[PDB]
Every structure is written in C-alpha cells, then in structure tokens.
Design a protein around this nucleic acid. Structure first.
Lengths: 220, 53, 173, 188
RNA sequence: UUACUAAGUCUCAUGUACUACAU
RNA sequence: GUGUAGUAUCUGUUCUUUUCAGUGUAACAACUGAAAUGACCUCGAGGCUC
C-alpha cells in the first residue's frame, strides 16, 4: 500500500537517466527504479522484447498465416535435388557435387540477412521484405528505371522522364548533387536503354589479413 | 497537459503521445516534440526535463 | 520529411514506388498500406525522406508529373480561449458578435450560435486569455439589444483554470 | 446449405455474386476478405454473416467507400411620470403627404419607424464619448438621437404578460406606438 | 487523403481433432 | 461402420450489485467485505448542496 504509493514519478526518474527516452511508464513500479533505469539505459544493453504484457503467447500473428513454408538457399538449390524429390503437393547425386556445393562453391557463402547486435524479432515482423529491401537499395540507383516501371509509366525508349523538364527549371535533386542526366549535365548520346543518367563521383589495403590464396578442403 | 482531458483507455492515452494537439501543447508550450517527452502527464515536470534538455 | 502520395493504382507495388522516387531523392522509408478487407493496396502511400528539403523538392518536381497506369500521381505535404455566452437577443447576428468582441480581442474563429432549453447562446473564440478576461470583465451581466447577456468560460470542467493561463500564455508565445 | 451457389476461388481472377465477400483461398477453407476470418463450414460462414463482427466490418468498409433625403424631423421631448418612477416620452411628427406622394410601391412602406440604443463609443469623428443615444429612424427622413445620461430610466419589469412577437426587439414592442394614420411616432 | 491494429471473459449451440478404455 | 470415460480447439452468443475499502495486479483483471433514503438546479454529465 504505502510502498505502492511511495513511487516517484517517471519524469522524476527521467532526470537520473542519460538516455531518458527508453524509460517507460511501467518503470514507476520498478522495485528499484533508480537502479533499473541505470541498467536499462546502460550503453550496450538490449531492452527486453516487448511481447511481454501481451497474453497472446507471443504468436497469434495474422502475418503467421501468410508466411512462406521455406525457400532453399540458392547455393543448395543449385544441387538440383529440388527436381529430384518433389516436396510440394532415386535422383542419383555426386559426392563431389554436394561436397563442393558446401565447401568449394559455398565456403564464402553466408545468409544475406542475418541480424545485428540488438535486432530482436517482434511478432508482426517479417525479415523477408526487409531482405528484398536491403537488396533493392543495392541494385536500384537513380538515373535508371526498369522496363516494367517504364512500361507502366508509358515512357518510350530514348525519351527522358517527365521530371527532367521540371528538373530543368527547378534544378538537380538536392539529395543527388553528383547526379547526371542526358540532355542536361550529361551527354545525351550516352543515353542507353533503361539508364538515362548516372551519378558521377567526385571523390576520385589488404587489411593486414589478406589471405592472398583460397584453398578449400578436398573430399578425395 | 491536454485540457485536463479524460481518456477512456490506456492504449488510447498511449496513442495520445503522438498526436497533433498533444504536440501542439508541447511545442507551443516551449517543450519541443517527439520521443523524449512521451511519458509526460503533468505540464510541470517536463519543464524541468526540457531545462535538462 | 514525410510526403503523402495518392491517386495510385493498386497494381503499383512497393518496389515500383521505391524505384520511382529514388530517381527524385533518397528515400528513407516507405509506408504503403495493404488492406485487410480487400487483400491488396488501397491506392495511396507515404514516402519518408531524409529531410524536408528533399521532401519539399519531391513535392515540387513530383506533383502532377509521373503517369502510372494512365492515372496521374498526386503528392501532398503532411488550444484557444472559448467563452460561453447566454441569453443573447434574437436580433444579434454572428457578424454583430464579431464586431462586439473584436474591440476586446482578436477572434481565432467565428462565434457559434446555438439554442438551449429557446435560450440563445454562443461560443466565442479568443486568441488571448487576457483579452478574454477583458470581454468578460466588461461584458459580463450586461444589456445589449435590450437583453441581459452573461459572459463566462465555456466548459471543456470550465476553461480558465490555473494551468490554463499558464499553457495558453505559452500557446500565445 | 450452400443453396447451390458457386463461390469462386480467390485466385480465379473475377456472373454476379450474392455477397462478393466470402471466398475460398488457395486452400479449401472459406474466408471473409473484409473480416479476414477463416471458416470451416458454410454453417460457420452463415454464423459469420449473421454475426455482429462481419456487420461492423461492412459498415467500416462503407465508411471507406464514402472516404436618404437626410431631413431632420421635429421631436417633442417631455418629462413624464407614472406609478413608481420617472420616464421619458418623445413625440416625433412626420410629413403631411407633401413628398410621400411619389413613392407608394409597398417597399417597406408598411414598416414603422425603428428605435435603438447606441453607445457614443463609435462616431464619424470619434472625439468625445461616454453616453447613450435613443436613435430613431425612418426610411426617407434623417436619423435622430437623444442623449441619456441617466444609467437607467423607465426600464420596467415585465410590463405585459410575456407575449412573443419580437418585432425587432423587446424595446420596440414594449414601449413604442406608431400612429400611422396621422404619422406620429410616440416613444416611452 | 483512411496515416496502418483488432479478438477477449460468460452463456448456450454448432465446427474439428484428440487421449485412456471395451468388443 | 461401434461403445465407455475423458481432453483440446474453433466459431456463435453475451455482458454480469450503480459505488466505496482491502487483497491482488506492471496496471488491469480477478478475488474479498458493506450498502441510502429523501429533496432541488442546468445541459447521461455536473453539486466547497442540504
């Protein structure tokens, strides 16, 4: 009773904290709030996954209904057993082939997503969309437009995007100062296919561990 | 901080932290927006918190 | 920072939006809703850039520019004193109210005329708690158009508390 | 229980449906696209339709679908008295069919003179002020005013028995008379 | 231009699996 | 193609004494105890009300 009503306000607790935004309303009933704020707000600690205080047993997810059953890592998919055995609703294989797939072909191979120091998987999360996202931030760059989005845009080949004219009056993108586009800052004769422009960088090892040779263990 | 307003749910009040009027009371009060001040209730304490900012 | 985009074909997908706007500026995040009542896309998205400079830039260059599935793409960027007044005369026009309260203080909005009980009452919005105190001090229990009117704070219980002067002062600031 | 209707699968790329909602997904189960609820049997589907849940989602989806000659007349002020105090009475006279013979097109001609109490706080010159005026107005003739230093005189208390023809205001009906036959406006 | 969250408890029915146990 | 006992899981349905205090809870929830009756005012809300 008295101890329950003795609690300091969470904002009174914020001042003790160097990173006050992590502390939350429920920290008021922390039996040792001044300590718990220091631990929770300590540098490298990773806050408890928030699926607690929910009674849903951490997975009720509607998204769980729509998750793909599985996908082979493409290196293993090269092994062709996908066609040999149909998992969806005998296939003689070579020892050298499989062994080389894991070792010769797949030594340097690593899953593309993984996760980071403090990455924690909440129920509603799905990594796959973020994998295509990270891969997409990689492939796609300004000045280039795929033929699909080009067809939807109804832009014929050899013709500049509609924002090149408004970009002539307004100016180059503030975010891309080094961006070049045919007809304006960049040679129109170099206009080719899906690329109407490219960023021209103005910036222009061994890491003590350079192996200088790569030799995998041989099965034979 | 909001008109001594009444809220009928804790999820809803936790949604008040990101709102137009709530941020208007903060920012027009001189307490700048976003995520440090989320746990605010009374007008007073976040003033010393903003002095700490 | 964040820009609203609309008039979007549900066949426009997330990768297509990303590839579209990266041509304009770098895109921090894309929230592109997916209906749980149609299992598709509801035809408007939100693109959060890395700053309001690139945001406003994309608003200027992007608006009424790109044509996707023959439909044009749209882009759009994303607390005051209140006095209850009772027993007004039927000859009192809202504009007459405006004239009466302008001398005391600037009105943030127009008065609201409503009938209780037969009983003509109005809400008057002042930009200042102190000017509201002026219209109260002078106009409380006064006879206008041969009718005695009462001027006080409207309920929220009623306005004019101690924290109300404090925060309304700040909203003035 | 299906009443012989054919519900096409969701992936069959849409014959008009009874309810264009319940579908069958890639699997054999039945689903409500709005509600996103799975149903084992058509009986469960009918329970869903007859349930308040589905209806609420239908209303939400419908909300989504919606989403002057200026001539000074002649006044005759006179100190009156009755009981129990003192009041003022004014006798304003108007033209004797001299100029009103050219204008008779029932344009507010039926409207009698009107009086209003004005504060001197607002004047064309704005020099001095601080007292009230009992202004009296008629369409052609020029306005007229009478200064009222006394804060209150003849300001009665429920003279008549609360009858509601506001005319213009309580003041006019309460204490004015318009002898239109002789053109004499009395005010007290 | 809609800036992304709903079911819970009870009651009385329906849907579907299952566990010991016997011919 | 059966019967005995028993279990789990959907879905439908529906909101249990208005309040107070204690336990309880991260807060809820839940549990434990009691019970106002009368009068009035403005638009179910409100009372330094009696």
């Amino acid at each position: 009773k008295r101890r329950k009503t003795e609690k300091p306000s969470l904002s009174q607790l914020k001042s003790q904290v160097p990173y006050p935004q992590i502390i939350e309303w429920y920290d008021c009933d922390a039996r040792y709030p001044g300590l718990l704020a220091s631990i929770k707000c300590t540098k490298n600690v990773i806050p408890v996954p928030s699926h607690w205080q929910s009674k849903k047993e951490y997975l009720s997810g509607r998204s769980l209904l729509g998750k793909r059953p599985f996908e082979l890592p493409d290196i293993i998919k090269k092994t062709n057993i996908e066609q040999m055995r149909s998992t969806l609703p005998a296939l003689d294989l070579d020892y050298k082939k499989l062994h080389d797939v894991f070792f010769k072909i797949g030594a340097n191979w690593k899953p593309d997503h993984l996760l980071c120091f403090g990455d924690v998987y909440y129920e509603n999360r799905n990594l796959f969309e973020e994998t295509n996202w990270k891969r997409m931030v990689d492939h796609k760059r300004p000045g280039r437009i795929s033929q699909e989005l080009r067809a939807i845009m109804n832009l014929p080949e050899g013709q500049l995007p509609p924002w090149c004219m408004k970009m002539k009056d307004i100016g180059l993108p503030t975010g891309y100062p080094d961006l070049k586009i045919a007809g304006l800052n960049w040679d129109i004769t170099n206009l080719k296919g899906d690329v109407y422009g490219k960023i021209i960088p103005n910036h222009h090892r061994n890491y003590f561990g350079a192996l200088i040779s790569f030799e995998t263990p041989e099965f034979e | 901080i909001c008109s001594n307003k009444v809220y009928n749910g804790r999820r809803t009040f936790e949604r008040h932290f990101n709102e137009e009027r709530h941020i208007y009371h903060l920012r027009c009060l001189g307490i700048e927006p976003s995520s440090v001040f989320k746990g605010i209730t009374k007008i007073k304490e976040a003033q010393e918190l903003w002095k700490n900012m | 920072n964040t820009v609203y985009v609309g008039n979007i074909d549900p066949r426009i997908t997330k990768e297509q939006l990303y590839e579209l706007f990266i041509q304009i500026n770098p895109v921090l995040r894309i929230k592109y809703p997916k209906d749980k009542v149609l299992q598709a896309y509801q035809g408007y998205a939100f693109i959060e850039f890395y700053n309001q400079g690139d945001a406003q830039y994309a608003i200027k260059i992007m608006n009424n520019t790109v044509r996707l599935y023959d439909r044009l793409i749209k882009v759009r960027q994303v607390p005051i004193a209140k006095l209850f007044i009772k027993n007004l005369a039927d000859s009192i026009d809202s504009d007459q109210l405006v004239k009466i309260f302008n001398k005391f203080g600037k009105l943030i909005r127009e008065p609201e005329i409503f009938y209780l009980s037969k009983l003509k009452c109005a809400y008057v919005y002042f930009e200042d708690f102190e000017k509201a105190d002026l219209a109260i001090k002078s106009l409380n229990n006064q006879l206008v158009a041969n009718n005695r009117i009462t001027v006080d704070y409207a309920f929220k219980n009623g306005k004019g508390n101690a924290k109300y002067g404090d925060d309304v002062d700040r909203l003035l600031n | 229980l299906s009443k012989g209707e054919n519900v096409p699968y969701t992936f069959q790329d849409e014959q008009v449906r009874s309810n264009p909602y319940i579908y069958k997904n890639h699997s054999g189960k039945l689903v409500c696209k709005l509600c996103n609820t799975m149903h084992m049997s058509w009986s469960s589907v009918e329970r869903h339709l007859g349930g308040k849940k589905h209806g609420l989602n239908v209303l939400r989806r419908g909300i989504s679908i919606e989403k002057x000659x200026x001539x000074x007349x002649x006044x005759x002020x006179x100190x009156x008295x009755x009981x129990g105090s003192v009041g003022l009475a004014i006798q304003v006279n108007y033209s004797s069919e001299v100029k009103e013979n050219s204008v008779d097109s029932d344009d507010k001609a039926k409207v009698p003179p009107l009086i209003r109490i004005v504060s001197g706080l607002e004047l064309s010159d704005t020099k001095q002020k601080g007292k009230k005026f009992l202004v009296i107005a008629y369409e052609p003739f020029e306005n007229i005013a009478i200064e009222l230093p006394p804060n209150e005189i003849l300001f009665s208390e429920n003279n008549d028995m609360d009858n509601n023809n506001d005319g213009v205001d309580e003041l006019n009906k309460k204490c004015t008379f318009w002898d239109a036959i002789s053109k004499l406006y009395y005010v007290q």
